[PDB]
């Protein structure tokens, strides 16, 4: 009852040389795709009522939420990289690429049901509607979430020495941007539908980086067992049913930051209108270079699950520190330039226009939650990311939101400039992960005693 998180610090020997630097080029290719993104936010500005994201950040609902499921394989296929067969890691790498198109045709069918924002209960940027050329980004860009799941199954088989996605998802963006505007209005091209057709154009390049997979059964021995990807063997064949509860717990836990989308976007329109909606040139600068952060461990989450088959029990989970804390070096030594700097005159009028004449009550959470979370789910990308342990890691997250229910109506009821004050027990909801998890990363690298059942050998 002083520390029921046991032998804390020790994740150290001479680990200075834990070199998962190619597990950052798992997410420097993710600035590469995070960044077509705005060159059609500000490409479909040619059209001015092309505020068009109007679906595109409420489509990336059943992208990144089904995504979790899919990026939930990174164990599966790293972990059996201390087995032998990429083709039974690939009869999975298929059975999922079935999923990665099976759930992908729900991405692609649930999107259908979707389109009835023809609805109302409160303020603008969440009800109104007269002219919707959104109608069709809702479909010319909601028809993709099939070919777009296999085109993430992809890096869910980058788990074993390649970042030949940083290769493609960079030539991907650039082939899109030319192609992006062709439809907004273009050449010989179908040159018309543009407010939607940025999106027909973006989703164009999904299907193209869906066969940036096909185009890499290319530089070495296979990952292609795409024989009939079917299943049946019991009532429902696993290596599939297996991904199931690496699935539910991932997405539904990507469904923290999924309500952190109906939180941060339900506190701009009390009487707070003005710079309380510019709490998003802020929190989209969370997204922005929170990604390369965050996702070092959702890139690291290999060199841990991978090195459990490769039977090094915490010769991984005590590198699950030495990488926990190494961008955690820059988790805090650039939470520095976060609460520090602002939208100066480098910010003209880009991703969500509001730069010249508003407040900094916005860098006030650029520390709050910022480094006391930075990492605290790059924990899970080595919990989940190592083990089973997203099972109720899930309920990691049934707190970081239900612990953060009342630091909702805790700016609206406040003591001072409480802008960052519903970021109260939602930066304290959000460092009871500095416990809950790296609590099970020392129940847990202390299961790689219990697991490592002979301590060494002879000569």
């Amino acid at each position: 009852l002083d520390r029921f998180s046991f032998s804390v610090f020790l994740k150290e020997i001479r680990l200075l040389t834990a070199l998962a630097l190619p597990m950052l080029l798992a997410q420097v290719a993710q600035v590469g795709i995070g960044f077509v993104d705005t060159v059609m936010a500000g490409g479909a500005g040619k059209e001015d009522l092309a505020a068009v994201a109007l679906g595109s950040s409420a489509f990336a609902t059943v992208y990144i939420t089904f995504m979790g499921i899919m990026a939930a394989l990174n164990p599966m296929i790293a972990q059996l990289y201390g087995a032998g067969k990429t083709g039974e890691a690939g009869e999975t790498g298929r059975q999922g690429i079935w999923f990665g198109l099976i759930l992908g045709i729900f991405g692609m069918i649930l999107m259908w049901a979707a389109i009835t924002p023809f609805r109302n209960w409160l303020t603008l940027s969440d009800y109104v509607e007269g002219t919707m050329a959104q109608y069709m980004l809702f479909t010319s860009l909601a028809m993709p979430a099939a070919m777009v799941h296999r085109a993430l199954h992809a890096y869910a088989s980058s788990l074993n020495r390649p970042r030949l996605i940083m290769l493609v998802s960079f030539a991907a963006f650039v082939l899109n941007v030319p192609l992006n505007y062709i439809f907004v209005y273009g050449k010989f091209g179908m040159p018309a539908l543009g407010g939607a057709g940025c999106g027909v154009a973006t989703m164009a390049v999904f299907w193209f980086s869906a066969l940036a997979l096909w185009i890499y059964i290319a530089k070495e021995k296979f990952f292609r067992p795409f024989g009939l990807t079917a299943k049946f063997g019991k009532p429902d064949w696993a290596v599939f049913k297996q991904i199931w509860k690496i699935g539910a717990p991932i997405g539904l836990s990507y469904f923290l930051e999924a309500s952190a989308f109906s939180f941060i976007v339900f506190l701009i329109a009390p009487f707070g209108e003005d710079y309380v909606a510019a709490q998003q040139v802020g929190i989209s600068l969370s997204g922005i270079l929170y990604m390369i952060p965050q996702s070092v461990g959702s890139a690291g989450t290999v060199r841990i699950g991978f090195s459990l088959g490769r039977r090094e029990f915490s010769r991984a989970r005590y590198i699950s520190g030495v990488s926990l804390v190494s961008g955690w070096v820059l988790a805090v030594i650039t939470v520095l330039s976060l609460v520090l700097f602002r939208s100066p005159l480098a910010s003209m009028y880009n991703d969500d226009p509001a730069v010249l004449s508003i407040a900094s009550t916005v860098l006030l959470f650029a520390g709050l939650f910022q480094p006391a979370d930075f990492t605290q789910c790059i924990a899970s990308y080595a919990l989940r990311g190592y083990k089973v342990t997203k099972v109720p890691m899930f309920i990691h997250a049934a707190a970081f939101w239900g612990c953060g229910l009342l630091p909702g109506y805790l700016l609206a009821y406040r003591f001072d400039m409480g802008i960052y004050g519903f970021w109260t027990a939602l930066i304290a909801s959000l460092t009871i992960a500095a416990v809950a998890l790296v609590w099970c990363l020392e129940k847990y690298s202390m299961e790689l005693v219990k697991s490592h059942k002979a301590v060494s050998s002879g000569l």
């Binding site: 039977r311 697991s451 490592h452 059942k453 002979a454 301590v455 060494s456 050998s457 002879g458 000569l459």
Partner: protein, 91 residues
């Protein structure tokens, strides 16, 4: 003229039975014997036996939580044994 099947690991039981996941870099001529006792001294030693690069095997671990100790056995060139190795950590 050599030394043992020289890795050691038992990851989990099925705490009646148990997995025994140990070295085998090829074989030799090839063969394995694997002892089958507690460290009690009573309850005689018994025998499992395997082939290929297959000391990476698993037990019938009948009896309960009690301390168990078990070794495996090279077999090579001379139809005899090229060295043995054990740990003892039970249910």
């Amino acid at each position: 003229v050599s030394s043992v099947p020289t890795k050691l690991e038992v990851v989990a039981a099925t705490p009646t039975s148990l997995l025994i996941s140990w070295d085998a870099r090829g074989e030799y001529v090839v063969y394995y014997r694997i002892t089958y006792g507690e460290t009690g001294g009573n309850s005689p030693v018994q025998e499992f036996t395997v082939p290929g690069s297959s000391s990476t095997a698993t037990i019938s671990g009948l009896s309960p939580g009690v301390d168990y100790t078990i070794t495996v056995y090279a077999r090579s060139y001379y139809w005899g044994w090229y060295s043995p190795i054990s740990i003892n950590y039970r249910t």
